[PDB]
Tab-separated table of C-alpha atoms in Angstrom:
chain	number	residue	atom	x	y	z
A	1	UNK	CA	-80.330	84.198	172.798
A	2	UNK	CA	-79.924	87.369	170.720
A	3	UNK	CA	-76.711	89.232	171.494
A	4	UNK	CA	-76.262	92.007	174.003
A	5	UNK	CA	-72.474	92.241	174.421
A	6	UNK	CA	-69.359	91.391	172.455
A	7	UNK	CA	-65.604	91.308	172.644
A	8	UNK	CA	-63.176	91.516	169.734
A	9	UNK	CA	-59.598	90.499	169.014
A	10	UNK	CA	-58.688	92.046	165.628
A	11	UNK	CA	-55.189	91.394	164.278
A	12	UNK	CA	-53.127	90.840	161.144
A	13	UNK	CA	-50.714	93.068	159.248
A	14	UNK	CA	-50.612	96.076	156.908
A	15	UNK	CA	-47.771	96.295	154.415
A	16	UNK	CA	-46.019	93.406	156.210
A	17	UNK	CA	-46.146	94.982	159.689
A	18	UNK	CA	-48.223	93.269	162.386
A	19	UNK	CA	-50.984	94.915	164.431
A	20	UNK	CA	-53.144	93.634	167.283
A	21	UNK	CA	-56.088	95.217	169.143
A	22	UNK	CA	-58.620	94.063	171.726
A	23	UNK	CA	-61.776	95.559	173.162
A	24	UNK	CA	-65.462	95.176	173.888
A	25	UNK	CA	-68.829	96.575	173.042
A	26	UNK	CA	-72.575	96.264	173.103
A	27	UNK	CA	-75.513	96.497	170.766
A	28	UNK	CA	-79.275	96.408	170.324
A	29	UNK	CA	-80.237	93.381	168.162
A	30	UNK	CA	-83.766	94.780	167.707
A	31	UNK	CA	-82.386	98.050	166.227
A	32	UNK	CA	-79.128	97.121	164.411
A	33	UNK	CA	-77.130	99.531	166.604
A	34	UNK	CA	-73.662	98.704	167.995
A	35	UNK	CA	-70.767	100.310	169.752
A	36	UNK	CA	-67.172	99.168	170.366
A	37	UNK	CA	-64.038	100.366	172.067
A	38	UNK	CA	-60.638	99.013	171.005
A	39	UNK	CA	-57.049	99.481	172.135
A	40	UNK	CA	-53.768	98.405	170.511
A	41	UNK	CA	-51.955	95.728	172.582
A	42	UNK	CA	-48.687	97.229	171.199
A	43	UNK	CA	-48.033	100.750	170.045
A	44	UNK	CA	-50.113	103.059	167.882
A	45	UNK	CA	-51.308	101.786	164.547
A	46	UNK	CA	-48.954	102.719	161.717
A	47	UNK	CA	-51.904	103.137	159.335
A	48	UNK	CA	-55.259	104.947	159.295
A	49	UNK	CA	-57.679	103.468	161.864
A	50	UNK	CA	-60.441	104.166	159.318
A	51	UNK	CA	-59.097	101.229	157.209
A	52	UNK	CA	-60.374	98.921	160.035
A	53	UNK	CA	-63.873	100.462	160.311
A	54	UNK	CA	-65.630	98.022	157.930
A	55	UNK	CA	-64.230	95.141	159.983
A	56	UNK	CA	-65.585	96.572	163.295
A	57	UNK	CA	-68.926	96.022	164.925
B	1	UNK	CA	-69.987	95.868	159.744
B	2	UNK	CA	-68.716	92.734	161.368
B	3	UNK	CA	-71.220	91.651	164.114
B	4	UNK	CA	-74.369	91.135	162.008
B	5	UNK	CA	-75.877	89.137	164.901
B	6	UNK	CA	-77.093	92.642	165.978
B	7	UNK	CA	-78.893	93.187	162.643
B	8	UNK	CA	-82.621	92.297	162.545
B	9	UNK	CA	-84.365	91.787	159.208
B	10	UNK	CA	-87.571	93.655	158.224
B	11	UNK	CA	-90.043	90.914	159.312
B	12	UNK	CA	-88.025	88.716	161.652
B	13	UNK	CA	-84.546	87.528	162.619
B	14	UNK	CA	-81.734	87.990	160.160
B	15	UNK	CA	-79.996	84.755	159.064
B	16	UNK	CA	-77.055	85.889	161.266
B	17	UNK	CA	-79.382	86.025	164.309
B	18	UNK	CA	-81.010	82.677	163.528
B	19	UNK	CA	-77.599	80.981	163.254
B	20	UNK	CA	-76.565	82.361	166.663
B	21	UNK	CA	-79.913	81.414	168.265
B	22	UNK	CA	-79.780	77.769	167.047
B	23	UNK	CA	-76.057	77.453	167.905
B	24	UNK	CA	-75.095	76.465	164.248
B	25	UNK	CA	-73.122	79.594	163.324
B	26	UNK	CA	-71.520	81.121	160.269
B	27	UNK	CA	-68.103	82.262	159.070
B	28	UNK	CA	-67.162	85.415	157.106
B	29	UNK	CA	-64.594	85.780	154.283
B	30	UNK	CA	-63.849	89.094	152.536
B	31	UNK	CA	-61.730	90.622	149.759
B	32	UNK	CA	-61.420	94.385	149.314
B	33	UNK	CA	-59.730	95.946	146.253
B	34	UNK	CA	-58.581	99.558	146.707
B	35	UNK	CA	-58.242	102.070	143.851
B	36	UNK	CA	-54.454	102.377	144.256
B	37	UNK	CA	-53.912	98.607	143.777
B	38	UNK	CA	-53.729	97.707	147.467
B	39	UNK	CA	-55.998	94.971	148.737
B	40	UNK	CA	-57.256	93.731	152.075
B	41	UNK	CA	-58.439	90.204	152.870
B	42	UNK	CA	-60.230	89.150	156.056
B	43	UNK	CA	-61.564	86.189	157.907
B	44	UNK	CA	-64.093	86.763	160.730
B	45	UNK	CA	-64.776	83.957	163.198
B	46	UNK	CA	-67.095	83.911	166.199
B	47	UNK	CA	-67.688	81.942	169.339
B	48	UNK	CA	-70.576	82.517	171.752
B	49	UNK	CA	-71.429	82.516	175.451
B	50	UNK	CA	-75.167	83.009	175.496
B	51	UNK	CA	-75.884	86.665	174.675
B	52	UNK	CA	-72.111	87.429	174.518
B	53	UNK	CA	-70.177	87.160	171.205
B	54	UNK	CA	-66.433	86.672	170.925
B	55	UNK	CA	-64.897	87.764	167.596
B	56	UNK	CA	-61.475	86.707	166.227
B	57	UNK	CA	-60.867	88.793	163.094
B	58	UNK	CA	-57.728	88.392	160.944
B	59	UNK	CA	-57.285	91.365	158.557
B	60	UNK	CA	-54.344	91.449	156.138
B	61	UNK	CA	-53.596	94.406	153.870
B	62	UNK	CA	-50.809	94.864	151.326
B	63	UNK	CA	-49.686	97.231	148.585
B	64	UNK	CA	-50.735	100.467	150.250
B	65	UNK	CA	-48.523	103.268	148.859
B	66	UNK	CA	-46.365	104.791	151.644
B	67	UNK	CA	-47.518	108.256	150.473
B	68	UNK	CA	-51.192	107.302	150.091
B	69	UNK	CA	-54.130	108.210	152.390
B	70	UNK	CA	-54.044	104.972	154.386
B	71	UNK	CA	-50.398	105.012	155.397
B	72	UNK	CA	-50.390	108.852	155.869
B	73	UNK	CA	-53.633	108.999	157.946
B	74	UNK	CA	-55.618	111.183	155.478
B	75	UNK	CA	-58.928	109.233	155.662
B	76	UNK	CA	-61.530	111.395	157.475
B	77	UNK	CA	-64.773	109.303	157.393
B	78	UNK	CA	-66.459	106.260	155.885
B	79	UNK	CA	-69.313	107.262	153.561
B	80	UNK	CA	-72.743	105.879	154.382
B	81	UNK	CA	-73.285	102.776	152.319
B	82	UNK	CA	-75.887	100.435	150.951
B	83	UNK	CA	-74.806	96.772	151.054
B	84	UNK	CA	-76.407	94.295	148.629
B	85	UNK	CA	-77.098	90.693	149.691
B	86	UNK	CA	-78.019	87.814	147.390
B	87	UNK	CA	-78.089	84.129	148.294
B	88	UNK	CA	-76.460	81.954	145.562
B	89	UNK	CA	-77.374	78.870	147.644
B	90	UNK	CA	-79.116	78.164	150.937
B	91	UNK	CA	-75.908	78.338	153.000
B	92	UNK	CA	-74.208	81.379	151.382
B	93	UNK	CA	-74.699	85.130	151.375
B	94	UNK	CA	-72.748	87.123	148.754
B	95	UNK	CA	-72.454	90.702	150.037
B	96	UNK	CA	-71.222	93.530	147.794
B	97	UNK	CA	-70.789	97.276	147.871
B	98	UNK	CA	-68.679	100.145	146.588
B	99	UNK	CA	-66.912	101.487	149.667
B	100	UNK	CA	-65.688	105.132	149.773
B	101	UNK	CA	-63.957	107.274	152.361
B	102	UNK	CA	-63.619	111.027	152.417
B	103	UNK	CA	-60.066	112.343	152.713
B	104	UNK	CA	-58.370	115.459	153.945
B	105	UNK	CA	-57.725	116.770	150.398
B	106	UNK	CA	-61.329	116.399	149.326
B	107	UNK	CA	-60.935	113.301	147.064
B	108	UNK	CA	-62.776	110.094	147.905
B	109	UNK	CA	-60.801	106.884	148.360
B	110	UNK	CA	-62.544	103.960	146.712
B	111	UNK	CA	-62.713	100.208	147.226
B	112	UNK	CA	-64.714	97.333	145.751
B	113	UNK	CA	-65.880	95.102	148.642
B	114	UNK	CA	-66.904	91.472	148.357
B	115	UNK	CA	-67.954	89.132	151.189
B	116	UNK	CA	-69.190	85.611	151.633
B	117	UNK	CA	-71.067	84.561	154.780
B	118	UNK	CA	-71.037	80.736	154.941
B	119	UNK	CA	-73.613	79.099	157.225
B	120	UNK	CA	-73.358	75.594	158.774
B	121	UNK	CA	-77.086	75.064	158.341
B	122	UNK	CA	-79.419	76.301	155.574
B	123	UNK	CA	-81.011	79.725	155.968
B	124	UNK	CA	-84.792	79.726	156.492
B	125	UNK	CA	-87.128	79.680	153.493
B	126	UNK	CA	-88.516	83.112	154.448
B	127	UNK	CA	-84.997	84.621	154.139
B	128	UNK	CA	-84.304	82.951	150.800
B	129	UNK	CA	-87.621	84.197	149.314
B	130	UNK	CA	-86.658	87.892	149.536
B	131	UNK	CA	-83.771	88.854	147.291
B	132	UNK	CA	-81.943	91.123	146.935
B	133	UNK	CA	-81.833	92.391	150.531
B	134	UNK	CA	-80.208	95.771	151.044
B	135	UNK	CA	-78.605	97.157	154.231
B	136	UNK	CA	-78.137	100.855	154.952
B	137	UNK	CA	-74.910	101.273	156.973
B	138	UNK	CA	-73.880	104.367	159.001
B	139	UNK	CA	-70.659	104.476	161.040
B	140	UNK	CA	-68.727	106.851	163.274
B	141	UNK	CA	-65.191	106.635	164.551
B	142	UNK	CA	-63.454	108.710	167.189
B	143	UNK	CA	-59.788	108.398	168.039
B	144	UNK	CA	-57.546	111.012	169.706
B	145	UNK	CA	-54.489	108.923	168.884
B	146	UNK	CA	-53.816	105.855	166.638
B	147	UNK	CA	-53.815	103.708	169.844
B	148	UNK	CA	-57.494	103.722	171.077
B	149	UNK	CA	-60.721	103.880	169.103
B	150	UNK	CA	-64.396	104.387	169.748
B	151	UNK	CA	-66.734	103.096	167.059
B	152	UNK	CA	-70.519	103.308	166.580
B	153	UNK	CA	-72.810	101.892	163.911
B	154	UNK	CA	-76.391	101.853	162.828
B	155	UNK	CA	-77.755	99.482	160.147
B	156	UNK	CA	-81.232	99.046	158.617
B	157	UNK	CA	-82.246	96.163	156.350
B	158	UNK	CA	-84.708	96.864	153.516
B	159	UNK	CA	-85.898	95.100	150.378
B	160	UNK	CA	-88.129	97.892	149.056
B	161	UNK	CA	-88.666	101.516	149.074
B	162	UNK	CA	-91.646	103.576	148.015
B	163	UNK	CA	-92.497	107.152	147.009
C	1	UNK	CA	-46.151	79.142	141.972
C	2	UNK	CA	-45.362	79.542	145.614
C	3	UNK	CA	-41.643	78.939	146.221
C	4	UNK	CA	-40.045	81.662	144.114
C	5	UNK	CA	-36.733	81.209	146.003
C	6	UNK	CA	-36.191	78.608	143.187
C	7	UNK	CA	-36.710	81.249	140.468
C	8	UNK	CA	-33.548	82.886	139.044
C	9	UNK	CA	-33.758	86.132	137.130
C	10	UNK	CA	-32.270	86.548	133.653
C	11	UNK	CA	-29.053	88.201	134.846
C	12	UNK	CA	-28.720	86.997	138.409
C	13	UNK	CA	-30.608	86.154	141.562
C	14	UNK	CA	-34.303	87.027	141.760
C	15	UNK	CA	-35.360	89.285	144.669
C	16	UNK	CA	-36.895	86.177	146.232
C	17	UNK	CA	-33.467	84.465	146.167
C	18	UNK	CA	-31.630	87.533	147.555
C	19	UNK	CA	-34.164	87.690	150.423
C	20	UNK	CA	-33.491	84.038	151.326
C	21	UNK	CA	-29.695	84.487	151.070
C	22	UNK	CA	-29.669	87.162	153.863
C	23	UNK	CA	-32.718	85.481	155.571
C	24	UNK	CA	-34.500	88.910	155.615
C	25	UNK	CA	-37.295	87.230	153.679
C	26	UNK	CA	-40.636	88.225	152.228
C	27	UNK	CA	-44.364	87.554	152.852
C	28	UNK	CA	-46.947	86.727	150.166
C	29	UNK	CA	-50.573	87.897	150.094
C	30	UNK	CA	-53.033	86.990	147.331
C	31	UNK	CA	-56.587	87.584	146.211
C	32	UNK	CA	-58.135	85.481	143.394
C	33	UNK	CA	-61.538	86.330	141.872
C	34	UNK	CA	-63.259	83.475	140.024
C	35	UNK	CA	-65.733	83.975	137.193
C	36	UNK	CA	-68.657	82.396	139.062
C	37	UNK	CA	-68.295	84.794	142.034
C	38	UNK	CA	-66.180	82.570	144.281
C	39	UNK	CA	-62.956	83.965	145.631
C	40	UNK	CA	-59.760	82.678	147.229
C	41	UNK	CA	-57.425	84.584	149.502
C	42	UNK	CA	-53.995	83.313	150.654
C	43	UNK	CA	-51.107	84.153	152.932
C	44	UNK	CA	-47.808	82.363	152.371
C	45	UNK	CA	-45.014	82.459	154.930
C	46	UNK	CA	-41.552	80.885	155.007
C	47	UNK	CA	-38.721	79.989	157.322
C	48	UNK	CA	-35.177	79.002	156.275
C	49	UNK	CA	-32.779	76.282	157.494
C	50	UNK	CA	-29.671	76.191	155.390
C	51	UNK	CA	-30.719	75.086	151.876
C	52	UNK	CA	-34.167	73.951	153.169
C	53	UNK	CA	-37.338	76.086	153.105
C	54	UNK	CA	-40.366	75.536	155.285
C	55	UNK	CA	-43.671	76.917	153.945
C	56	UNK	CA	-46.865	77.612	155.973
C	57	UNK	CA	-49.605	78.519	153.498
C	58	UNK	CA	-53.147	79.493	154.548
C	59	UNK	CA	-55.580	79.327	151.630
C	60	UNK	CA	-59.281	80.225	152.113
C	61	UNK	CA	-61.958	79.926	149.483
C	62	UNK	CA	-65.666	80.700	149.527
C	63	UNK	CA	-68.702	80.972	147.280
C	64	UNK	CA	-67.846	77.975	145.003
C	65	UNK	CA	-71.197	76.735	143.658
C	66	UNK	CA	-71.869	73.136	144.779
C	67	UNK	CA	-72.572	72.241	141.139
C	68	UNK	CA	-69.708	74.328	139.766
C	69	UNK	CA	-66.440	73.123	138.215
C	70	UNK	CA	-64.389	73.244	141.432
C	71	UNK	CA	-66.865	71.176	143.518
C	72	UNK	CA	-67.685	68.707	140.714
C	73	UNK	CA	-64.066	67.850	139.635
C	74	UNK	CA	-64.366	69.438	136.152
C	75	UNK	CA	-60.909	71.123	136.159
C	76	UNK	CA	-58.457	69.175	133.926
C	77	UNK	CA	-55.295	71.327	133.824
C	78	UNK	CA	-53.964	74.787	134.618
C	79	UNK	CA	-53.170	76.653	131.403
C	80	UNK	CA	-49.614	77.803	130.900
C	81	UNK	CA	-49.376	81.400	132.085
C	82	UNK	CA	-47.376	84.554	131.892
C	83	UNK	CA	-47.152	86.401	135.222
C	84	UNK	CA	-46.454	90.131	135.215
C	85	UNK	CA	-44.364	91.784	137.980
C	86	UNK	CA	-44.000	95.462	138.660
C	87	UNK	CA	-42.489	97.092	141.720
C	88	UNK	CA	-44.588	99.961	143.109
C	89	UNK	CA	-41.830	100.580	145.723
C	90	UNK	CA	-38.506	99.005	146.676
C	91	UNK	CA	-40.112	96.539	149.143
C	92	UNK	CA	-43.133	95.438	147.105
C	93	UNK	CA	-43.817	93.276	144.063
C	94	UNK	CA	-47.319	93.430	142.532
C	95	UNK	CA	-47.913	90.266	140.536
C	96	UNK	CA	-50.871	89.828	138.205
C	97	UNK	CA	-52.218	87.366	135.638
C	98	UNK	CA	-55.412	86.039	134.160
C	99	UNK	CA	-55.510	82.414	135.355
C	100	UNK	CA	-57.485	79.782	133.366
C	101	UNK	CA	-58.081	76.072	133.693
C	102	UNK	CA	-59.352	73.705	131.024
C	103	UNK	CA	-62.460	71.752	132.027
C	104	UNK	CA	-64.399	68.645	131.091
C	105	UNK	CA	-67.221	70.938	129.830
C	106	UNK	CA	-64.980	72.069	126.935
C	107	UNK	CA	-64.824	75.575	128.440
C	108	UNK	CA	-62.155	77.344	130.454
C	109	UNK	CA	-62.648	78.374	134.065
C	110	UNK	CA	-61.313	81.852	134.612
C	111	UNK	CA	-59.813	83.836	137.521
C	112	UNK	CA	-58.236	87.238	138.042
C	113	UNK	CA	-55.122	86.699	140.177
C	114	UNK	CA	-53.452	89.474	142.257
C	115	UNK	CA	-50.450	89.068	144.582
C	116	UNK	CA	-48.199	91.236	146.678
C	117	UNK	CA	-44.739	90.093	147.778
C	118	UNK	CA	-43.665	92.285	150.680
C	119	UNK	CA	-39.943	92.335	151.473
C	120	UNK	CA	-38.366	93.100	154.900
C	121	UNK	CA	-35.412	94.850	153.175
C	122	UNK	CA	-35.320	96.787	149.888
C	123	UNK	CA	-34.806	94.887	146.668
C	124	UNK	CA	-31.502	95.652	144.870
C	125	UNK	CA	-31.398	98.629	142.515
C	126	UNK	CA	-30.502	96.416	139.556
C	127	UNK	CA	-33.836	94.472	140.107
C	128	UNK	CA	-35.805	97.670	140.277
C	129	UNK	CA	-34.328	98.947	136.913
C	130	UNK	CA	-35.985	96.181	134.809
C	131	UNK	CA	-39.761	96.477	134.783
C	132	UNK	CA	-42.067	94.889	133.960
C	133	UNK	CA	-40.597	91.413	134.512
C	134	UNK	CA	-42.582	88.516	133.109
C	135	UNK	CA	-42.540	84.830	134.206
C	136	UNK	CA	-43.563	81.944	131.941
C	137	UNK	CA	-45.111	79.276	134.229
C	138	UNK	CA	-45.893	75.626	133.385
C	139	UNK	CA	-47.359	73.105	135.800
C	140	UNK	CA	-48.309	69.455	135.936
C	141	UNK	CA	-50.469	67.666	138.520
C	142	UNK	CA	-50.736	63.912	138.978
C	143	UNK	CA	-53.661	62.752	141.165
C	144	UNK	CA	-55.092	59.248	141.052
C	145	UNK	CA	-56.740	60.186	144.337
C	146	UNK	CA	-57.588	63.550	145.870
C	147	UNK	CA	-55.652	62.867	149.020
C	148	UNK	CA	-52.192	62.335	147.406
C	149	UNK	CA	-50.826	64.800	144.867
C	150	UNK	CA	-47.639	65.106	142.860
C	151	UNK	CA	-46.877	68.543	141.388
C	152	UNK	CA	-44.150	69.775	139.004
C	153	UNK	CA	-43.371	73.234	137.741
C	154	UNK	CA	-41.052	75.076	135.409
C	155	UNK	CA	-40.714	78.858	135.349
C	156	UNK	CA	-38.674	81.210	133.153
C	157	UNK	CA	-38.223	84.942	133.850
C	158	UNK	CA	-37.957	87.319	130.854
C	159	UNK	CA	-38.178	91.048	130.316
C	160	UNK	CA	-37.795	90.989	126.550
C	161	UNK	CA	-38.500	88.945	123.502
C	162	UNK	CA	-37.091	89.336	120.012
C	163	UNK	CA	-37.969	87.956	116.492
D	1	UNK	CA	-27.618	79.723	150.391
D	2	UNK	CA	-29.934	79.082	147.452
D	3	UNK	CA	-32.574	76.478	148.192
D	4	UNK	CA	-32.339	72.781	147.339
D	5	UNK	CA	-35.357	71.354	149.235
D	6	UNK	CA	-38.589	72.403	150.845
D	7	UNK	CA	-41.471	71.260	153.000
D	8	UNK	CA	-45.025	72.562	152.900
D	9	UNK	CA	-47.953	72.720	155.257
D	10	UNK	CA	-50.964	74.033	153.299
D	11	UNK	CA	-54.241	74.453	155.056
D	12	UNK	CA	-57.385	76.528	155.287
D	13	UNK	CA	-60.977	76.003	154.215
D	14	UNK	CA	-63.161	75.819	151.091
D	15	UNK	CA	-66.832	76.789	151.428
D	16	UNK	CA	-66.373	76.720	155.226
D	17	UNK	CA	-64.930	73.189	155.410
D	18	UNK	CA	-61.338	72.777	156.670
D	19	UNK	CA	-58.573	71.012	154.720
D	20	UNK	CA	-54.986	70.309	155.668
D	21	UNK	CA	-52.064	68.803	153.679
D	22	UNK	CA	-48.338	68.283	154.349
D	23	UNK	CA	-45.486	67.277	152.082
D	24	UNK	CA	-42.080	68.084	150.681
D	25	UNK	CA	-40.188	68.580	147.472
D	26	UNK	CA	-37.071	69.779	145.732
D	27	UNK	CA	-36.038	72.286	143.118
D	28	UNK	CA	-33.253	73.657	140.991
D	29	UNK	CA	-32.719	77.363	141.833
D	30	UNK	CA	-30.602	77.831	138.689
D	31	UNK	CA	-33.388	76.575	136.399
D	32	UNK	CA	-36.704	77.519	138.099
D	33	UNK	CA	-37.868	73.894	138.272
D	34	UNK	CA	-39.642	72.427	141.312
D	35	UNK	CA	-41.352	69.236	142.371
D	36	UNK	CA	-43.681	68.552	145.356
D	37	UNK	CA	-45.546	65.627	146.890
D	38	UNK	CA	-48.450	66.406	149.247
D	39	UNK	CA	-50.772	64.257	151.304
D	40	UNK	CA	-53.963	65.158	153.145
D	41	UNK	CA	-53.795	64.792	156.973
D	42	UNK	CA	-57.633	64.330	157.034
D	43	UNK	CA	-59.400	62.446	154.228
D	44	UNK	CA	-59.555	63.252	150.515
D	45	UNK	CA	-60.008	66.815	149.441
D	46	UNK	CA	-63.684	67.833	149.059
D	47	UNK	CA	-62.850	70.129	146.124
D	48	UNK	CA	-60.772	69.935	142.925
D	49	UNK	CA	-57.033	69.687	143.783
D	50	UNK	CA	-56.440	71.908	140.720
D	51	UNK	CA	-57.736	74.850	142.822
D	52	UNK	CA	-54.561	74.453	145.012
D	53	UNK	CA	-52.104	74.199	142.117
D	54	UNK	CA	-51.439	77.978	141.900
D	55	UNK	CA	-50.404	77.891	145.608
D	56	UNK	CA	-48.004	74.911	145.215
D	57	UNK	CA	-44.299	74.964	144.518
């Protein structure tokens, strides 16, 4: 089927320091619209969350 | 963007949608070169449970100046963008754009983005026949803290425009 | 190159060596843009056991044309290179070079190579005083079959040259 | 101490197809010389081994 829901595990490191987030979202595959909520599984990100935006959906 | 299974094409399914529907799939590889010498690399991988997608995205960035807008949280928004797709072969999309953020001091922060989408099975003839394909990309991000985020996106594929 | 713990500097240990000696270590991140649009990204990680290093290297490439020099075994040697290091901050090396191979087509196959080495602890002040640092790199590959390789390297660090 | 020997696990994918190799080598940390032997843990590499050379040591 076409998608209706999604979950994401996004992780890696910035400047040598690990990060890890999880969350879930939805979208309309007939309209190209999507939304997502994410939370760090550790502390706050040490870098701008905007740097992740192109890797979100 | 990162879940292009939600993107339709102008006259039918996008290749991303077709590869989910037929259970063959694709993988995503990216390299992003920032103006201040930093770079980000990423690998996006998916599994599926029917209409539900599971993403595992590994994003690695290095060389960001400690006093620059990334490490000091000065990015304010991602500019609207137009992404260009061409298909160098029947299993590969090369995606490019110039990516810019606005910042708190009024300068833009620039990046050259490159992406390959690699498909297990060839894309359909009707996809391959229309190149380039362009995608208009709008995003929004809220976050009260650097701990939780709310993201929204709208994309529109187009190969033409008139006036 | 990929095990710079074996590289001395002209006047003493390289930062790579100092970082092994205290086991604080460093991580390597790379992006490599090939002339025919393909790119490679890599993450190199190490652990230390006495005089023995263990490397875990993840190398991802995409967009290599099926009829190009990488997928049709045209590469014949890696050209000797000079790598340039500068240190944007006390925990980061930015390494660059233009990387070329000879090929069976009588042409070279070109790549723009970028690397960050990110250190857990600051590099010593005496390292930071000598910039840029350059590294002459020679390699040899023996490969009767593609499953079994033998590799050799020689590197020489220099910040100066006279004549 | 300075290194005398090393082992390598190098893995990943090219054009979406996985590869995996393991091996070991030696080097002289006073001279910048190194040697390595690697073997695939699957079958032969599907791409030119020269593309890995820059990531060997």
